[PDB]
Amino acid sequence: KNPKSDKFKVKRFHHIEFWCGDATNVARRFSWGLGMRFSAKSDLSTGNMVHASYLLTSGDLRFLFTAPYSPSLSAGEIKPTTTASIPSFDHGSCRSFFSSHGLGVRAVAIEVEDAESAFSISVANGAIPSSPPIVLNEAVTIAEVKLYGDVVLRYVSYKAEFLPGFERVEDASSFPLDYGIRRLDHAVGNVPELGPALTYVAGFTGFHQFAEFESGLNSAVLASNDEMVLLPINEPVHGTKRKSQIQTYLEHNEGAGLQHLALMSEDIFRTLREMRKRSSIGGFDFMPSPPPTYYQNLKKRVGDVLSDDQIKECEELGILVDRDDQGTLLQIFTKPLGDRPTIFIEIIQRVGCMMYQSGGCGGFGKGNFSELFKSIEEYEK
Amino acid sequence: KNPKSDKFKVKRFHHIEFWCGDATNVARRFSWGLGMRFSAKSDLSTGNMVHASYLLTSGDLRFLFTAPYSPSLSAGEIKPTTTASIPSFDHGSCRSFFSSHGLGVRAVAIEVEDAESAFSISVANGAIPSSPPIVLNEAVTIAEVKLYGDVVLRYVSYKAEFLPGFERVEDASSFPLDYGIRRLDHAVGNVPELGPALTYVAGFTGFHQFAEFESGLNSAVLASNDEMVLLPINEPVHGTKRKSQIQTYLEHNEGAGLQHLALMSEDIFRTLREMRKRSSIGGFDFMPSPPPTYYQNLKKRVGDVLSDDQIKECEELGILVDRDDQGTLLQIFTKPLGDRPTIFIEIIQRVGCMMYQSGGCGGFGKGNFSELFKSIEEYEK
Numbered sequence A, B: 001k002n003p004k005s006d007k008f009k010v011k012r013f014h015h016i017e018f019w020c021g022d023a024t025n026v027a028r029r030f031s032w033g034l035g036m037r038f039s040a041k042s043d044l045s046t047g048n049m050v051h052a053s054y055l056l057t058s059g060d061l062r063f064l065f066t067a068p069y070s071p072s073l074s075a076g077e078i079k080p081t082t083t084a085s086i087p088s089f090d091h092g093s094c095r096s097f098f099s100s101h102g103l104g105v106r107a108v109a110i111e112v113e114d115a116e117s118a119f120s121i122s123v124a125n126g127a128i129p130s131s132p133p134i135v136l137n138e139a140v141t142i143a144e145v146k147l148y149g150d151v152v153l154r155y156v157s158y159k160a161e162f163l164p165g166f167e168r169v170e171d172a173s174s175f176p177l178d179y180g181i182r183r184l185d186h187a188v189g190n191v192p193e194l195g196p197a198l199t200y201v202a203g204f205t206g207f208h209q210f211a212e213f214e215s216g217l218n219s220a221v222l223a224s225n226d227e228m229v230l231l232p233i234n235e236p237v238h239g240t241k242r243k244s245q246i247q248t249y250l251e252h253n254e255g256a257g258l259q260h261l262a263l264m265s266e267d268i269f270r271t272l273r274e275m276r277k278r279s280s281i282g283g284f285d286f287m288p289s290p291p292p293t294y295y296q297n298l299k300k301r302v303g304d305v306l307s308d309d310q311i312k313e314c315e316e317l318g319i320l321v322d323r324d325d326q327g328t329l330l331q332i333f334t335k336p337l338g339d340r341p342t343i344f345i346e347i348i349q350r351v352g353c354m355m356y357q358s359g360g361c362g363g364f365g366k367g368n369f370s371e372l373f374k375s376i377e378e379y380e381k
């Protein structure tokens, strides 16, 4: 059931912004680890005395990494005279965010036809304003509302080069890395109580519940009209035998915030080969391997979609596989991206539901919870 | 002239500790960029609820990267019951250091025979105590005094595995990277006024002035008895045509602090080939190239130490070369290690002064200031 209730028109994810203490080191780690090119900068070299911001891109995926400079470099400025390229930026907000959460996502930015209307409609429907709409170089409008915790939903609209004031990175300082990652598929929040969080976000966006088909979670997925923009939210299930991963998140994150980013690959086998190659030389580690019992039940589940060679390839790379009403989902999770057991990344590829591919094809892997529990018992046999 | 006036016995540099906001991302960037292996950890996985600390090693070089967790994980602890592996660590001090300076060096640690005596003698000779001596697991003693700015000089002594409470990193999660870097050669501070800084540090250590043989600097080098431990200090020269790099440092760093770490390589050609290979895929960038006039005057200076093949190799890699009373110095500088124009790294190899090699052999490149100025004029001809 898709009522198509978006209160303003939404296109697609535009970028994800990380708030960090050093944007250079995080951006270079992520670039090597995920195979993303350095494509735009805004910093001292471009006349930005406020923040350093570096953009990495892979296909349509845009990761922005931003950290503050000493406030003393911009003490003479006022908001109208600012040299920040992201006018919503605030030294104290950024410093307070990082000291509270460590490295994490500050803004989930979606592109809209009209960011000012998006902001107005949103707030008129209960969104908590975070930063009012501001027109950038007569070309781009940016506005922010609170999403959950200290994460904001950033609206971006273009009248017609990432953002004004950013410069393209020099050819020599930009290496054409690519491991097959192509776009952001969904962005997931962890909150203490799912009900109020869903009601708030569904309330100001018009996004509808997407619906799926023990685990330490309960969750729901909000989606835009074409279900391209997918924003799931998790809450803990207390009292379970194993402590809820969501509860561990909330404790180490100091409250609600973004849990994982799921990135679509055009070739999850190539992506995981390239990323695993680099795990111990600066890249990302992956979740522990599932038992062989899991991969010895994979043919009886998905053998109609993937060859026995590809199923062996899944056991080598640790890929998990689940099946929807409509399609198949290949998926794997990284270990946390930084010091804290908080944010992590999911790599995915979905097979099926072609019209282009419809969003959410295959679901989010809900069945892998019970399939992994069984193989755990079956292996100890 | 070496009076050998050390007030307590000093052996060698033990480690350099970086204070960061995320220790994972910085440590993985540095590991790939410099070719250093992950060798020890102290973090949640080892029962440290206070800080995450990761040690990288190359030859004798030890870089430690430390960031704080949420204070809430250790709210129930007191100093006697702490789970920190570095008892000098303080959440507020670390958070305040990083927000003030960004990524930078907190501790220059030197090994001594008796860290408690080192601390006592030091303070009795004017050192400002930073953290009193503390015996770790009946095996290791650690103590800290102020060095300059918010940088401390950390004394370490062993009765007889980096530090107690650290664990060796698992074989799979530790990749044998090595680009030829072998040990720390010197660590340089930038201060607003050299005189008072020298008097303070020379005052509590007994270190003697090492002495060398326009530039926006004036500087002096303090050295231990065998001149292995080398601690130069810079101050700005105001009024020069080009603004002093030291003054730019002090403004962006919010005051005095560590400017550069010079790392000895056993093969500076191999090191710079490996590091430059990785500049645009997560590693470190290097200083701009000198003109060819510089390398067209290199034979008439050092042609007795390096072949014309090696001199061509210097022009390819951008290596600079200077000559002492006693030896030859090969050297090159990175661009700053993080967002701010503050800390950077120097790679060096020295040729000569063999007895082992005596410390400081070749100097620190003082002549390259006037050799580079000339080649600049000669190239515009």
Ligand SMILES: Cn1c(=O)n(CC(F)(F)F)c(=O)c2cc([N+](=O)[O-])c(C(=O)C3=C(O)CCCC3=O)cc21
Pocket: A186, A188, A217, A219, A220, A221, A232, A233, A234, A245, A259, A260, A287, A320, A333, A346, A364, A365, A366, A368, A369, A372
């Ligand atoms: C498939 N799957 C899984 O098998 N396990 C067990 C494993 F593999 F770790 F052992 C997970 O723990 C796991 C955790 C998460 N999560 O979001 O925390 C997700 C996930 O992506 C997801 C969403 O995107 C929105 C709806 C909620 C949801 O579950 C999937 C998971």
Ligand SMILES: Cn1c(=O)n(CC(F)(F)F)c(=O)c2cc([N+](=O)[O-])c(C(=O)C3=C(O)CCCC3=O)cc21
Pocket: B186, B188, B217, B219, B220, B221, B232, B233, B234, B245, B259, B260, B287, B320, B333, B346, B364, B365, B366, B368, B369, B372
């Ligand atoms: C050799 N040399 C140089 O040629 N230039 C010009 C170039 F190349 F950048 F264009 C420098 O700027 C430069 C800067 C520094 N510094 O410390 O800032 C040092 C250096 O290492 C040093 C010490 O270790 C202790 C004593 C002070 C001192 O000068 C060497 C440099």
Ligand SMILES: [Co+2]
Pocket: A186, A188, A260, A262, A346, A364
């Ligand atoms: Co997911």
Ligand SMILES: [Co+2]
Pocket: B186, B188, B260, B262, B346, B364
């Ligand atoms: Co030097």
